[model samples]
Target: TCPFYKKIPGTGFTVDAFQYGVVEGCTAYFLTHFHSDHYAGLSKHFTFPVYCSEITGNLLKNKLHVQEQYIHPLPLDTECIVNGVKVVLLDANHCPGAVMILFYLPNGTVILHTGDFRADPSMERSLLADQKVHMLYLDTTYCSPEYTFPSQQEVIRFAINTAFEAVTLNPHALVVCGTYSIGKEKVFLAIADVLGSKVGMSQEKYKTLQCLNIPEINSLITTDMCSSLVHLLPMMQINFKGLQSHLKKCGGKYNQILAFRPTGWTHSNKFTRIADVIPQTKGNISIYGIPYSEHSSYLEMKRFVQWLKPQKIIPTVNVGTWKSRSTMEKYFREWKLEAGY
Candidate 1:
């Protein structure tokens, strides 16, 4: 509420649990997506009611496990009254549970808040075509061509292909990767389909699954769901040797093991060391580097801006699209070069 206007023009701030308390009037605050950055301040405090898609609401219950007392779910691509303002929730194709909100002010001026999203053809075609959107809050996290990410299908195919190659070379190999317990389930499921087995979950991971009712998943647990395949969920920070011991006890004898881990390399410095240690962990364990990120790349960001065609594009989170006000201004300057495609 007491922000330096020059410093925060878009009327948004960086990550802070306390920032949620600043919304003075019951201004419409739509929960566009479920990423931690998008919903950072919701749990701590709130004055306006958050309108989110139904899928996100289910995810919050099963994935975030947040208290159900506070959520207000709305059907996708539909308008609803949010904090006395008309709002619409559109699909944001970054993750299984994502959305963009359109806040239709009473004065006929409309503002579009695109929560973390990417260029998805299906999603674009499904958006409301009749409404007039004025200002857009975009996610310009990767506003440079240098930043690239593979499509979801590409990543899944790569994972399955990698598994087949590893298994052909070594039959009893196990796959190990670091993923959020809930976020990368699709990839894991795809891998399972390729191996004709279920992914392995550690005791803790299995507990998380049990709590969430992860249906038909054959985890690495007491009851074996499949004989030939399993996704091995490792302890968060266990050493390579410790991991080998755990795997060996589970009957992985010279079996090929692949570790899928997210290192967030751009923001961290230890990926090099993590890379170095992968080879030494288990001779059977192979490391696969896949960026199944939810944020849009530079090209995707530009196209999104064009779709909304807003007079002003305010980048929301400062680290990427929301990096800074100046960062967004620079994006608009370059958007004309390749906004449409």
Candidate 2:
């Protein structure tokens, strides 16, 4: 166990409330990242001072819905004492708001809690030098040695290419792609760059975005006042008569179209079929399927576990979402257990 509490939930024998609540009156709590699995309980169990990075705090305050004063953004590479416990935040490449926590006690015992993270070269270069570690709360999403991920730039290219190809075929069609609402905007901006940065995003799109604030997508806007460029479109009115008519009339030789749900779209057969109904340039309509997912894949998850080498790794985010958890745990137990924490 994590020493502070028992593995079982809702037990009086445990340290205190759940892991998120008071633990024998331990005033300080450390958060690895702002993802829902890690930080969602904060609103329910935490009210005391919470420790994390600035980016994480900004994300939580704006996106995750948390109070400001309770959030203390720790500096990277700089160790600080919070309620007498030494804490350090390490940059994680999983997401812009990601962080890996290195916690040290006064007794020289150490614990590394990697919030969901990836073993990108930048992350490896930053933390590979730390040879001495005690207990590691590793994320075993991709613990197998065979696991690997393509470059971030490559992922961006893949998404952009998929979107562009879909758009080319059905100019007046509604192109749908899947991305987490939190980070989906970047994908659209990435597509804009591939489509010619200056002319890709229409002026009306920019004006609509001004009313609805989505920071991630807005950050990548090519213009200084990019907020004025994105427009807010209803996710599903069902009555697409107005949108359909406008698209066909306004769609020029370039085959002008719109991408629905710029931030988040579910991956399902029904979703694909519905999106496929959009009018193609001439006659045909097709659902362009792209291989992209927000959460880490089997290989990426395994590499993350290997790099951190934590003692106990428990996956929270895609627990029942896929079939790789048991397989991933087995790999983590075999490889990470060699350290014998």
Candidate 3:
């Protein structure tokens, strides 16, 4: 029942349309970030100019090995004319190099394609708050009330405190922070900083973080597993048995293993207070499910959409079913009825 049009209406520009291949009438293609879902069908067989942030462009060329000639990395908050359409890149708070695609079309329509963002107060203070958006292609990942959770900073603080105290109380406990390839970095970086521990990951992932250009990394990350207490790994190897096997393999250096799954799904209206951490423990292994999400929470999305006040809303995610799309429409309609929106 969904139109599933990645191409923005009334413009030749397609936002995050690699998965659809070269759509029939679209002239320009935009990549919001390096995530698989967004950059799904991208390959060297590119037929049009692909515009993205310079950091994301770096990954596309180096990691994906896409042709350099077809890549156009635009500077943040700066205007660039692509195919006669005026465009600007605003930082999408979801991950490093993620950007909200802003376009000024020939018909003078201002479209904001927010490619997965956490709408923090910093965003409200930015230039995006002032722009009049005609159509907002939104990231509606957590648009319902059931998905409510605390902000990223709050959740990060909780994660740091929880992990720090876990290590302190256990002394020989090895902390494993679950992370994605690009997003959810703050959870590990902050926890590692507080624990005064080195962050461990494969050398390959360490190189990708280098492309992010977060100089604050400041020699904290490494590939030496024996040198670090906190190992930041993908979610796949985060099971208790997997961690226990590693603990045994570490030659008795770590007596206990504690892992943090810092994600929004943990909230799910399960706990009395969303901030309360859930500890699923078995023997000496424990995993904490923290509500640390990169996407905007239900209320924060309301706050941002209320601030943006677009003439129309087009969701980019969770549109597979009519029920899913209709669910977000109710939130959209409710947002308009709010007092000053």
Candidate 2 residue-wise lDDT, 8-43, digit = tens: 222222211224445654455556554555554556
Q: TM-score of each candidate?
A: 0.75, 0.62, 0.93
Model 1 score (lDDT): 0.57
Put down candidate 1 lDDT per residue, 248-283, tens digits, no spaces: 766535454566664332422223322233233445
Which stretches of model 2 miss by more than 4 angstroms? 1-24, 42-46, 63-65, 142-151, 162-180, 196-289, 293-297, 300-329, 336-341
Q: How accurate is candidate 3 locally (lDDT)?
A: 0.82
Quantify all predictions' global Cα lDDT against the true fold: 0.57, 0.49, 0.82
Tell me the number of clashing residue pairs for each predicted model: 24, 17, 0
Summarize candidate 3's per-residue lDDT along 154-202 as a digit string, tens digits.
Answer: 7777778888888889889999987766888888888888988879888
Residue-pair clash count for candidate 2: 17
Q: Residue 22 lDDT in model 2?
A: 59
